[PDB]
């Protein structure tokens, strides 16, 4: 009814420990969600065009041309790690657990409140807010996944990460098909590169509406909505990283001479000439057996063209890579391709008291060593006459195409049947948790944006809207915009995310890396004197595991 | 007890024929294993560094820098074909069988003998050997695979291939994490290329010890150890090779004119103009239908950058390839990338009476025709105007990067969704049998070092050690090395490897290739007048099978 609550606030994470080292981690997340009535009650097909920016030669990477259907609905998205765990919970998970499973998801809307705003004609602004007890909130659960999948974490538009801070839903929109051509150029190109937007292909048109595709529930102040429990079928997520490169696979060479005194200058020596050694190599025309030429079971990681942009029907897009750059751990400035960069606002980890539109940014460096150091790569002749001469070796400094800033590694691909790689680690708090699998016939082996992928399906998107609150002067025949009473809603969203995790075991004599609070990061986890909070990112795959 | 044997010597291979053309091949292998007490009773973290060798410009491929934990334990490894089969058994297998399955593995240690050495003070050396009836041999079976996987076949350090020749175990060591950077150079580079060893990443440290990870059994002269039967879950291994290239897939063109007289100069002719023919091609802008342009179901084999070295956290390593070079069968000198080269000593096939540290070497040429002949490759313009002109074709002789010894094929990768390839053939006697699968999330489609791969796990590594035999003057507080009575052990190792194989069938009118003894190789299988034995390599995939 009007004066009866329809739900309870719960934001507790429970760790129920099972037998055999397994734990059920049920994270509860409760938020107060504020929603305004849509700017327009219609669906719009809006073409965003920034040909001015890309008309500058060399700016083709800044292309934003696209077409989107803007809908009157808003999306309630909780597909981010920060929506579910605080730094203490994440510390417990990443320190005491070795693998993580995604078990189930539930969400519900309760304690719906709808208020109308009456603004007076007095010259200084003044307004009052009245409860509209008969107003309704339109809630649609796309449990069949009919609507396009538009996760908000990629735009930093999920629910807020603070239980005590009210959050908002994101206005929903989806991509409409378009055709676009953009010939790349550079500073110094003469003429106007081909840069046109060709329109839309009629055979690819797909105009979706929530009304025609999903059942819609009208919730009054005394109503509540529950989606029901959804159960995932994803793969386990490892909370351990691998450190072994191809150089550290298998049996090391026997050292016939060992150091007689400790110290950094004292080295063990194999004691056998490199061309007189025993072993197996894939180089059938050389007698040298070294750490770089000896046979290994397979290849850890792969090389791909980095900062390569491929053009397709809808324009250019960067070629993704599964693994981050090698050497970003020895030198943090080397983080670039494959090291995801997260930019977020005050709702999602940035200092809440900051002013301005500049977001808080961080580049994530994974502990796994599956990356590549292209500056140390090279190609050489099949003859393999050592030491190699100039014409028989292609080095990373050799120009490709006549460009001194482009080398073969930029266009180099080593993906093959022997490539072995890991899934992307969870990124806390701004990383996505689960992502829908592509509906293609042949599917990618992994996604670079979420550690869990939906093989069959994952829970339907939740859409909310303020039902039209018409005045007495509504005329559907009029071409002017619908006249509505200014209405807004505040409702409580509660979600339950259930994981299954395995407790880690100590395999080595030495201790391992753990996340800990210290003097440097001590104040990143507590509020300031005025209430300013923040959530800094945390690494997940802290403990190491042996690859081979 | 002291005077009671605890096992029997068995080195027989049994072929028990089943119904429906299947045979159980149980190979028994018995060896006398001699073990010396470890040089040191401690674990050492030894850094092998050869910066002197790689400081020579162009010698970066000879990098041996690495770090290893040297343990006081020795590894008993029987993961090689020669440990289980003699040339007659291998001939029977490769001639009468079409596929091979790895069923089970057992090993055991018995008839343990421990002897102490007493050396006299007399000026001419003289010594006696006494049985230490109360001395113990420490045996650890890592059935849980907690320790790093270090197969010895890659170093030619498995058990000997001769039943009547006593063998030794290999001292065990494993790779410790390290960071290394090496900028490639060539003869003619000016300056000192960046060449440093950066140390160890604390987050990747993994110090393993047998004592803290595996149960240890103390075997006295009257004790024996049995691991128990382990059962594999690997894929079948084909003993047949494929000969069909993309040029030999599907229906050949109809010959409207056939030769009227036999002879090498008389050819059949299609009789239709290449641009007037019927068929399907993937080239949508050409009317030519030829043997090189006609559509095929998929691609057999693939091209990859050969003799490409990729650098990662721990230095440079050669990029592996699944298939060997094409044309190595028409010209044995073309064997290079992908054709494994085996180097071994007198225990593993080399003439036992040879003197010197030079190993016996051979490059393996597989009968399967999945390789590539890069000298016959080329790229040309999408326009496809024939005959192609200079600027519209990139040939294998065209310099890439300005280097006349490097062409596009050196950096060329054609692996894709249409690539079809075979697993590596068994290499007798020096090839590995089974290999552990990588613990990565995404796993390689095959391993280039063993025909069988351990999906879940494969039998734990066996470690042996001589238990410390202290003197009366032991003082654990002393910083000097432990003083031990010089002790060594001789024990009998018996293993049983069970395979399941299918008998081959005659599918064609003509006979097929079989391994046979002849005048040229007659004396490669019998001892010399002084007992000198050898085991030359044998090819496995002799018979052909149709790919399509």
């Amino acid at each position: 009814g009007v004066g009866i609550s329809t739900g309870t606030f719960n934001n507790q994470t429970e760790f129920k420990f099972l037998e055999n080292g397994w734990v059920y981690i049920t994270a509860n997340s409760s938020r107060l969600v504020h929603l305004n009535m849509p700017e327009s009650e219609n669906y719009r097909r809006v073409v965003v065009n920034n040909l001015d920016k890309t008309a500058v030669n060399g700016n083709m990477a800044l292309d934003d041309t696209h077409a989107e259907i803007v809908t009157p609905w808003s999306l309630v998205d909780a597909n981010a790690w920060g929506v579910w765990f605080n730094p203490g919970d994440w510390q417990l998970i990443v320190n005491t657990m070795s693998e993580l499973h995604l078990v189930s998801f539930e969400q519900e809307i309760f304690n719906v409140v709808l208020k109308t705003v009456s603004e007076s004609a007095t010259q200084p602004p003044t307004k009052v807010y009245n409860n509209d007890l008969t107003a309704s909130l339109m809630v649609a659960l796309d449990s069949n996944n009919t609507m396009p999948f538009t996760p908000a974490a990629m735009r930093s538009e999920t629910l807020g990460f603070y239980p005590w801070k009210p959050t908002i839903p994101t206005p929903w929109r989806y991509y409409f098909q378009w055709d676009r051509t953009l010939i790349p150029s550079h500073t110094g190109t003469s003429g106007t590169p081909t840069n046109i937007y060709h329109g839309t292909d009629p055979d690819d048109v797909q105009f979706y509406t929530i009304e025609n595709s999903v059942p819609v529930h009208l919730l009054r102040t005394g109503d509540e909505f529950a989606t029901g429990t959804f159960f995932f079928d994803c793969k386990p997520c490892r909370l351990t990283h691998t450190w072994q490169t191809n150089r550290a696979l298998g049996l090391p060479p026997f050292l016939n001479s060992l150091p007689q005194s400790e110290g950094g200058t004292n080295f063990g020596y194999i004691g056998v000439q490199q061309d007189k050694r025993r072993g197996v190599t894939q180089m059938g025309n050389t007698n040298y057996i070294t750490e770089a030429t000896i046979m290994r079971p397979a290849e850890v990681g792969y090389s791909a063209p980095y900062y390569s942009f491929e053009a397709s029907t809808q324009g250019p897009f960067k070629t993704p890579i599964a693994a981050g750059r090698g050497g970003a751990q020895t030198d943090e400035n080397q983080a670039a391709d494959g090291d995801p960069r997260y930019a977020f606002g005050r709702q999602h980890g940035q200092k809440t008291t900051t002013t301005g539109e500049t977001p808080e940014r961080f580049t994530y460096i994974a502990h796994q060593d599956t990356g590549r150091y292209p500056e140390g790569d090279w190609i050489q002749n099949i003859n393999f006459n050592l030491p190699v001469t100039d014409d028989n070796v292609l080095l990373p400094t050799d120009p490709i195409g006549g460009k001194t800033g482009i080398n073969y590694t930029n266009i180099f691909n080593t993906y093959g049947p022997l490539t072995a790689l890991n899934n992307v680690p969870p990124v806390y708090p701004n990383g996505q948790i689960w992502d829908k699998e592509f509906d293609t016939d042949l599917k990618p082996r992994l996604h670079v944006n979420a550690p869990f992928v939906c093989q069959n399906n994952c829970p339907g998107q939740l859409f909310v809207k303020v039902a039209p609150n018409l005045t007495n002067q509504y005329d559907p025949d009029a071409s002017a915009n619908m006249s509505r009473i200014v209405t807004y809603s505040d409702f409580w969203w509660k979600g339950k995310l259930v994981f299954k995790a395995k407790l880690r075991a100590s395999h080595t004599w030495n201790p391992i890396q753990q996340m800990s609070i210290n003097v440097d990061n001590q104040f990143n986890y507590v509020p300031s004197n005025i209430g300013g909070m923040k959530i800094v990112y945390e690494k997940s795959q802290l403990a190491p595991r042996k690859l081979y | 007890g002291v005077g009671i044997s605890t096992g029997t010597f068995n080195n027989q291979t049994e072929f028990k024929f089943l119904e429906n053309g299947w045979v159980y091949i149980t190979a028994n292998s018995s060896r006398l294993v001699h073990l010396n007490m470890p040089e040191s009773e401690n674990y050492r973290r030894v850094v092998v560094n050869n910066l002197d060798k790689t400081a020579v410009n162009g010698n970066m491929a000879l990098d041996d820098t690495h770090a290893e934990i040297v343990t006081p334990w020795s590894l008993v490894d029987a993961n090689a074909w020669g440990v289980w089969f003699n040339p007659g058994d291998w001939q029977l297998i490769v001639n009468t069988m079409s596929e091979l399955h790895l069923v089970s593995f057992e090993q055991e240690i018995f008839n343990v003998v421990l002897k102490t050495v007493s050396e006299s003070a007399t000026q001419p050396p003289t010594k006696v050997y006494n049985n230490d009836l109360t001395a113990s041999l420490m045996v650890a079976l890592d059935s849980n695979n907690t320790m790093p996987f270090t197969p010895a076949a890659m170093r030619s350090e498995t058990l000997g291939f001769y039943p009547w020749k006593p063998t030794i175990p290999t001292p065990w060591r494993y790779y410790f994490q390290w960071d290394r950077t090496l900028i490639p150079s060539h003869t003619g580079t000016s300056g000192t290329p960046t060449n440093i060893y950066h140390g160890t990443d604390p987050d990747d440290v993994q110090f393993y010890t047998i004592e803290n990870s595996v149960p240890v059994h103390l075997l006295r002269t009257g004790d024996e150890f049995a691991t128990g039967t382990f059962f594999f879950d690997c894929k079948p291994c084909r003993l047949t090779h494929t000969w069909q290239t993309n040029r030999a897939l599907g229906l050949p063109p109809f010959l409207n004119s056939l030769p009227q007289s036999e002879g090498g100069t008389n050819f059949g002719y299609i009789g239709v103009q290449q641009d007037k023919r019927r068929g399907v091609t993937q080239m949508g802008n050409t009317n030519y239908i030829t043997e090189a342009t006609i559509m095929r179901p998929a691609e057999v084999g693939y091209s990859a950058p050969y003799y490409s070295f990729e650098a990662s956290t721990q230095g440079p390593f050669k990029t592996p390839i699944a298939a060997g070079r094409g044309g190595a069968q028409t010209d044995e000198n073309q064997a290079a990338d992908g054709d494994p080269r085996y180097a071994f000593g007198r225990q593993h096939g080399q003439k036992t009476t040879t003197t010197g540290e030079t190993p016996e070497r051979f490059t393996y040429i597989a009968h399967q025709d999945t390789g590539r002949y890069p000298e016959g490759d080329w790229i040309q313009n999408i326009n496809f105007n024939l005959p192609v002109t200079d600027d519209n074709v990139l040939l294998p002789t065209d310099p890439i990067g300005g280097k006349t010894g490097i062409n596009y094929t050196n950096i060329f990768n054609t692996y894709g969704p249409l690539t079809a390839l075979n697993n590596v053939p068994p290499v007798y006697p020096n090839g590995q049998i089974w290999d552990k699968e990588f613990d990565t999330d995404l796993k390689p489609r095959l391993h280039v070092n063993a025909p069988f791969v351990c999906q879940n796990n494969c039998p734990g590594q066996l470690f042996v050690k001589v238990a410390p035999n202290l003197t009366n003057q032991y003082d654990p507080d002393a910083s000097a090395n432990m003083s031990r009575i010089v002790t060594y052990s001789d024990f009998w190792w018996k293993g049983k490897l069970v395979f399941k194989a299918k008998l081959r069938a005659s599918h064609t009118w003509n006979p097929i290739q079989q391994m046979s003894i002849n005048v040229d190789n007659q004396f490669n299988y019998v001892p010399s007048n002084i007992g000198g034995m050898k085991i030359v390599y044998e090819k496995s995939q002799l018979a052909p099978r149709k790919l399509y």
Partner: antibody
Amino acid sequence: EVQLVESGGDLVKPGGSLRLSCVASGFTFSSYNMGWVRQAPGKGLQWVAWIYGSRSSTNYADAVKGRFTISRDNAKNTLYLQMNSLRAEDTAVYYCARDGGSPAAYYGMDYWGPGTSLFVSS
Amino acid sequence: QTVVTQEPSLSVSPGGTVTLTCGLSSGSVSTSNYPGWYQQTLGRAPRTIIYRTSSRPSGVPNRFSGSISGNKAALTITGAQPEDEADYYCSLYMGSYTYVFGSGTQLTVL
């Protein structure tokens, strides 16, 4: 945009010490390898010191090894060159140098400061 | 010790083409040396003309071109203007993290 300003150059007697300070603006200071070059009065440019990497690894020319120390403070966006046991041969104009390649270094001085003169005389 | 040799002095008429060369007494200059060219006027700090043997910083006129000729680095000024008269210094990356500088070439526009 990218600006480098050097200061601390002053007359100093032989055998003394002096710290040159280089203030950088218009760019992320910690993301670029920095260095100190020097030009003697009437002579050509000579590389003095280089600081590179997130670990602040340092390399020095043979003429200043053991005597010069190159450091950086990214909080202050400052580069410090501390010279000890100064000689008459160290008298010169010292230029701040910034490499423009953060993830792929140009291995060359992308930006230069106005320079600070140091005179060593008894 | 590494020594970089370049022409002590060079001359060019207005609107002409001149080439300044930078070599090594022992060895050859390649793209692995990342040759850099810097321009210095009297009483002013050096200005970067070329980096990575071909790249001129934004604002550098196109008349300056960097290349590798023979076993040396080459800086070519085409249509040389009066303001191009200055001391041009060549920097070679000598591996590891060591840099070397040439003696310098005094280019005067007639």
